[PDB]
Amino acid sequence: SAVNDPLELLTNKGTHEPSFLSPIWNPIACGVAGVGAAIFINWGFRKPVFSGIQKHIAFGAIGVGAGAYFDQKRNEYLAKRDAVLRHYIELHPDDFPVKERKTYGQVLESWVPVR
Amino acid sequence: LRSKYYDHPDGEDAFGKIVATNKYAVSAGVAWSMFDVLTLSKPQGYLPTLGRFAYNTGPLMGMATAFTLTTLVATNARGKDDKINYLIGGFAAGGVFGAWKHNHVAGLCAGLFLGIAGVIKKMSIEQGWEFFPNTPIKQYGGLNIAGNDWTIMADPPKNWTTEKPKE
Amino acid sequence: MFNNSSKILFITIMIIGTLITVTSNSWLGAWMGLEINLLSFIPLLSDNNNLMSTEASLKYFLTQVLASTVLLFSSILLMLKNNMNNEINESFTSMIIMSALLLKSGAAPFHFWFPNMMEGLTWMNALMLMTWQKIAPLMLISYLNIKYLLLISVILSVIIGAIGGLNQTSLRKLMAFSSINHLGWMLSSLMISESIWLIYFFFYSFLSFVLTFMFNIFKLFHLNQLFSWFVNSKILKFTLFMNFLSLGGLPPFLGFLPKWLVIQQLTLCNQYFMLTLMMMSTLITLFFYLRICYSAFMMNYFENNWIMKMNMNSINYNMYMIMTFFSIFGLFLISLFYFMF
Amino acid sequence: QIRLLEDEVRRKMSERNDYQAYYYRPSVAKYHRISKEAADELEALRGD
Amino acid sequence: MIQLMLYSLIITTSIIFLNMIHPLALGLTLLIQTIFVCLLTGLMTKSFWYSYILFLIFLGGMLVLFIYVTSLASNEMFNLSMKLTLFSSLILIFMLILSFIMDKTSSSLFLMNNDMQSIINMNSYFMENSLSLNKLYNFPTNFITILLMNYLLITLIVIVKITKLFK
Amino acid sequence: MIMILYWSLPMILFILGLFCFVSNRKHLLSMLLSLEFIVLMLFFMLFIYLNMLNYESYFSMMFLTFSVCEGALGLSILVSMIRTHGNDYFQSF
Amino acid sequence: SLTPFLRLPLTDLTGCLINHQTYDKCGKFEMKMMECFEAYGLERGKRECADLISDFQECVGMQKQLMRFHAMRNERYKQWLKGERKGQEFFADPPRVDAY
Amino acid sequence: VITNNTTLPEESELNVQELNLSSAALRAGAFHLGKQCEQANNEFMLCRQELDDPRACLAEGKAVTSCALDFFRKVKKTCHEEFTQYATCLDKSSGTMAFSHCRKTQGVFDKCIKDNFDWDRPSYGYFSRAKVIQSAREAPKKEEKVSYPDATPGLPEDYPKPPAKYGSRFHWLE
């Protein structure tokens, strides 16, 4: 368009495709943390980092859950934030009259001559 | 008593101007004075205590007056209001600092420093910004800030309604 | 929960008392909660086993009691001359209430008691005063809205808070000065916003919590002890000590995440000058932390001879260095935190 | 572009505090109503 | 008149309080202060109920600790000075004659004693403490009393934790 | 002025109490006794306000119950302190 | 009343701690206010409770009314000092005790 | 608080006859007076109870005092010695003015009333009960609710929440 519409600019028109990494990143970050923490545990205790994999599996399980649990909370959180902002724009159209897009041919800026 | 240094032209009402500064000068002077008389000097008696307060306050009067008059002198005669004007203002202030401190090097270096201070101060006065502007935003919590209630008393209905008048 | 069972009891009563304050509806209720905090904390602080604990107790009591006295008093005045808890505007009625609260939490001009305290306190007792005895007065400072007083506090909250830290050789006093500086950041952050202040305190709680919790573990009380504390490899001597730099919040240490958050929102308020000053002093804070880390960055120092083995609790050590590992690699959790929006 | 919009809206919404969101400070008459109820409960109760 | 005379007696005793340094002399001074303050709050109250209360808790029981532990005695008894007494008498009298002079009413509080309430007030014809102390026990403002008693219980757990340092 | 004629006396006494709290005394007992006088004045300000209020009056007990506990804690730590050092004298500080 | 941030179940003890409203003439004014504070929050409401806060404060605070009396009686004394009022006129008639 | 624009009654309006009776005088004739004139009082101080502005209750108040005046004039004419004695007991007998110390005179005074008007002494608490009465003033104040049209709104639970736009909309989407 040629019309700087705040609402339509904000509206979830889409065009946001998650990566193969986009959702998976948190699970393979928290689990990687917990696994590394268990290796950290054995490293300081002078125990084999491999040894006692029950600690590593449990750390992985808890972390994975939290990342998935918290990924969910964010997505709800972000959705609500958009809802309020769209609501406030709809509430005060007078405060945010839709603005018109122009082109450089209609403007005069000041440049910097290196010379 | 109640005047503003920076609410007038940069070359007018010297006396009112210095007063609007000297108040913000004396505040620091006596403020440090009560702060240190009880820590280091601890001079038993009231005249000795008057001495420490006098020793502390006078020099800061010297600093403010020296800065003000030199810079006021500039605009009166140099006829302009420039960053350089406050720079000579700061040079004079630290020259007074060296004079009282009886440390020639310490006064001169601070005089350069105070000139930088005045330079930045003039930049604020002339570029329409401020060091400690009031806040444009003051937040009180997440979006669910209204939803973080966990109380367990039943609330009977309200006496007010958002709905439009029905007359 | 240090030695006795009563530690659990007084901690519980303390929690209830402070929780009253943060949930208090009116100044009086907040004052009530504060005094209950005053009760519950004195016995923990005043261990009957040694001496130094007891002297800290009179100073803590003799200070907090006056703080509560003035706080309630100034409350009555404000909530007389305004006949309402939320005054229309901040006048002389209200600055006294902050001056009460600032002393209670140990802010810039009202701090001298706070270093003298540290001598008496043991580690986790100190820790507990460091973290939790500063919630309630700060959350109240939130309600009070006098810009300039907070600003003078923030100005002076780092100058002394770092210059003194340069001078101290007793770890007890360094933690005092370290926090007074950090307290400078909370106070500014609360002048700006509260949600960010909530976050920053929490990360500060976490960081200070892990820090002193290992010092408790190994009972390292003096810079000499740090240089002398045996470790088998003198490598975990260095891996564990990264957190001393997480104090300064340098990016790859997770202390940056809060400092970044405060800086971002603060400059969004456009108090650029204030940022410069606090952030100038931050370097002095990080300066003596390197002064601490001379013990571990280089390896294979000169050591005492008699020690052959070094030992510590399972529970404390097991908890401790999980918190450390997070202090090492915390940033990549950038996604996991969603409370900043 | 959207980020600049968000800040502007956040600027307005903080200046006016219209909307029950980040820049809001909900109050509560619940406790006053409750005390109002207790007063009602005991006025009718007065007298044996 | 009683009210402002009672101010005067409190002022004079307060001047006594800030001078005296012997612990008994100070503790004695508190004792008088308490009677005076009980009298004064009673006058401006609906009745003297609270005055009797805080008398027997504050003075009757709790100042016993202060005098008792301040039985250090200084190892020697008072050297009473008839001069501060005479000044106390002197300052009292012309304050007292001024009290005779001062404006009869405007120099008085405005609070509403049971008598200074209007006749129509149907509530005022109940037992003087009935309606005042009602909500100390009636819900939902009575649990705080439960907090008080447990606070006092916990206070004893604390005292036996501090007062039991190896003996 | 309302405060000058009504809330003035409580102020003058309260400030005098604090100054005596920061004066010079052989031991801390004079301090504890000083803050104790302040509590009575604190009660005085509190009651005249609670008297503005028809039934909120009862809050006296809440303040009194709390205040006596401060005093008890005050005497508690002092008395344990004599017992520790054989003295709680300010020269020990 | 300043808003507890957390609003946890232990605001449930002190929120109704001590109430202006009950059995108070000013209490009617408290309700006239506190409803609005609920409507406009605590910051816009504090902006838009001009009359509500004025009268609510005046009822309990008595500032405006009481200070009106203080000047009113001072002025009586002032004319006496100038000598306008003599031994008789210096005071008015006594209200019948059974009044007010 | 009162101003010259406010409305007040006339001196003449206030100027009506009053009882002039003592405490013992009233407290003696209380019971047999209460049931003769209670409608006067009931509607009188009912309007006072519901509505406090006394400017309107002046008329019914005049009725109340008149009605009591009428009763005692009847007492004056019919039973003087009996009533006076009962009054003399009720104060001389006790400093608390309790009916439980000269009931014999109370009985004989009741006899005289029984002979003159044949009225019955009301119950122990005939006036202690509630008074449910008829409406004569007929002025119920209006029950109303306030309306703040521009109150601060939030996000209703029905407002659609389209899934988020541009991830977390943060620096690098993360």
Domain parsing of chain C, residue ranges: 1-341
**Half-sphere exposure in the Cβ direction for C285 (13 Å, CA):** 30
Q: Helix, strand or coil for residue B133? A: coil
Q: Tell me which chain C residues have a C-beta less than 8 angstroms from the C-beta of F49.
A: 76, 79-80
> Does chain A reach chain F with at least 3 CB pairs under 8 Å?
no
Cα dihedral C176, C177, C179, C180, rounded to 10, equals: 110
Q: Tell me which chain A residues have a C-beta less than 8 angstroms from the C-beta of C329.
A: 33, 36
Residue with tokens 């810039």: C108
> The tokens of G5 are what?
């941030």
Q: CA–CA distance from E100 to each of E94, E97, G83 (Å)?
A: 9, 5, 21
Q: Tell me which chain D residues have a C-beta less than 8 angstroms from the C-beta of B142.
A: 22
Residue H102 contacts residue H85 (beta carbons within 8 Å): no
> The tokens of B93 are what?
């202030």
H or E element, residue B15: helix B14-36
Q: Tell me which chain B residues have a C-beta less than 8 angstroms from the C-beta of A80.
A: 143-144
Q: Which residue from C52, C35, C48 is spatially nearest to C6, judged by alpha carbons?
A: C48
Q: Helix, strand or coil for residue C338? A: coil
Q: Helix, strand or coil for residue F78? A: helix
* Beta pairing, strands A99-100 & B160-161: unpaired
Residue of H150, H159, H165 for testing the chain A interface, max A β-carbons within 10 Å: H165
Determine how many CB atoms are found less than 10 A away from the CB of residue H87. Answer: 22
Strands (E), E34-162: none
- Minimum Cα–Cα distance from A23: chain C residue: C335
Q: How far apart are the first and last CA of chain H?
A: 65
Q: Helix, strand or coil for residue H124? A: coil
Q: Which of residues 45-64 of B touch G (CB under 8 A)?
A: none
Distance, CA of C146 to chain centre:
23
Q: What phi, psi does C67 have (nearest 5°)?
A: -60, -50
Q: What phi, psi does H157 have (nearest 5°)?
A: -70, -10
Give partners of A (≥3 CB pairs < 8 A).
B, C, D, H
Give partners of C (≥3 CB pairs < 8 A).
A, B, D, E, F, G, H
H or E element, residue A100: strand A99-100
Determine how many CB atoms are found less than 10 A away from the CB of residue G78. Answer: 12
| Long-range contacts of B116-125, Cβ-Cβ distance < 8 Å, separation of 24 or more | B116/B87, B116/B90, B117/B90, B118/B67, B118/B71, B118/B83, B118/B86, B118/B87, B118/B89, B118/B90, B119/B83, B119/B86, B119/B87, B119/B90, B121/B86, B122/B81, B122/B82, B122/B83, B122/B85, B122/B86, B123/B83, B125/B6
- Cα–Cα dist C150/C157, whole Å: 10
- Cα–Cα dist G92/G78, whole Å: 15
Determine how many CB atoms are found less than 10 A away from the CB of residue H149. Answer: 10
Residue with tokens 């939320």: C86
Residue with tokens 């109340």: H64
Q: What phi, psi does C222 have (nearest 5°)?
A: -160, 145
Residue with tokens 């580690």: C123
Q: Helix, strand or coil for residue G21? A: coil
Q: Kindly state whether C66 is in contact with chain F, defined as any CB-CB distance less than 8 angstroms.
A: yes
- Cβ H148–G65 below 8 Å, yes or no? no
Backbone breaks in chain C after residues (C–N over 2.5 Å): none
H or E element, residue E9: helix E2-19
* Beta pairing, strands B160-161 & H146-147: parallel
CA-based nearest distance F19→chain C, Å: 12
Q: Tell me which chain G residues have a C-beta less than 8 angstroms from the C-beta of B162.
A: 39
Residue C147 contacts residue C191 (beta carbons within 8 Å): yes
Q: Which of B132, B134, B141 sits opposite C194 (nearest CB)?
A: B141
Q: Which residue from H89, H66, H85, H70 is spatially nearest to H32, judged by alpha carbons?
A: H70
Q: Which residue from C229, C181, C199, C212 is spatially nearest to C324, judged by alpha carbons?
A: C212
Q: How far apart are the first and last CA of chain G?
A: 33
> Does chain G reach chain A with at least 3 CB pairs under 8 Å?
no
Which residues lie across from E66 on neighbouring strands? none
- DSSP annotation of C222 reads B
Residue with tokens 């309006």: H13
Q: Which of residues 66-95 of A touch D (CB under 8 A)?
A: 84-85, 87-89, 91-92, 95
**Half-sphere exposure in the Cβ direction for E97 (13 Å, CA):** 5
Q: What phi, psi does A107 have (nearest 5°)?
A: -130, 155
Q: What is the DSSP string of chain E?
A: -HHHHHHHHHHHHHHHHHH--SHHHHHHHHHHHHHHHHHHHHHTSSSSHHHHHHIIIIIIIIHHHHHHHTTTGGGS-----HHHHHHHHHHHHHHHHHHHHS-TTTTS-----STTS-TT-GGGGS-TTTTTSGGGTSTTSSHHHHHHHHHHHHHHHHHHHHS-S--
Written as one letter, the residue type at A82 is: D
Cis peptide leading into D26, omega within 30 of 0?
no
Q: What is the CATH number of the domain that holds F36?
A: 1.10.287.3510
- Cα–Cα dist C44/E157, whole Å: 12
- Cβ D23–B158 below 8 Å, yes or no? no
Q: Which residue from C331, C332, C316, C329 is spatially nearest to C210, judged by alpha carbons?
A: C316
Q: Helix, strand or coil for residue A4? A: strand
- Minimum Cα–Cα distance from F72: chain C residue: C39
Q: Which of F1, F2, F59 sits opposite G18 (nearest CB)?
A: F59
Instruction: Count Cβ atoms within 10 A of the Cβ of residue G71 and give its class: 0-12 exposed, 13-18 middle, 19 or more buried.
Output: exposed
Say which residues have a Cβ less than 8 Å from residue B144's Cβ, sequence separation at least 6: A80
CA-based nearest distance E82→chain F, Å: 23
- Chains C and D form CB pairs within 8 A to the count of 4
Helices G25-39 & G50-61, crossing angle to 10 degrees? Answer: 150
Could you tell me how many helices (H) and strands (E) chain G has, helices first?
5, 0
Q: Kindly state whether H3 is in contact with chain G, defined as any CB-CB distance less than 8 angstroms.
A: no
Residue E100 contacts residue E61 (beta carbons within 8 Å): no
Specify the experimental method.
cryo-EM
Q: Which residue from C131, C129, C137 is spatially nearest to C107, judged by alpha carbons?
A: C137
Helices (H), H15-152: 23-28, 30-34, 39-50, 54-78, 81-92, 103-116
- Cα–Cα dist E123/D1, whole Å: 66
- Cα–Cα dist C186/C199, whole Å: 10
Q: Helix, strand or coil for residue A53? A: helix
H or E element, residue H146: strand H146-147
- DSSP annotation of B12 reads S
Residue C147 contacts residue B131 (beta carbons within 8 Å): no
- Cα–Cα dist B137/D22, whole Å: 10
Instruction: Count Cβ atoms within 10 A of the Cβ of residue C179 and give its class: 0-12 exposed, 13-18 middle, 19 or more buried.
Output: buried
Say which residues have a Cβ less than 8 Å from residue A4's Cβ, sequence separation at least 6: A98, A99, A100, A101
| Residue F18 lies in domain | 2-92
Q: What is the largest CA-CA distance in chain C?
A: 71
Q: Which of A76, A78, A80 sits opposite H155 (nearest CB)?
A: A80
Say which residues have a Cβ less than 8 Å from residue H141's Cβ, sequence separation at least 6: H50, H51
- Cα–Cα dist C297/C300, whole Å: 10
Rg of chain C over Cα atoms, rounded to whole angstroms, equals 20
Which resolution, in Å, applies to this structure?
3.7
Residue C212 contacts residue C316 (beta carbons within 8 Å): no
- Cα–Cα dist A10/A8, whole Å: 5
Cα dihedral H56, H60, H62, H63, rounded to 10, equals: 170
Residue E37 contacts residue E6 (beta carbons within 8 Å): no
- Cα–Cα dist E10/G4, whole Å: 39
- Cβ B152–G11 below 8 Å, yes or no? no
Q: Kindly state whether G10 is in contact with chain B, defined as any CB-CB distance less than 8 angstroms.
A: no
Q: Kindly state whether C89 is in contact with chain H, defined as any CB-CB distance less than 8 angstroms.
A: no
- Cα–Cα dist C160/A25, whole Å: 44
Residue F78 contacts residue F89 (beta carbons within 8 Å): no
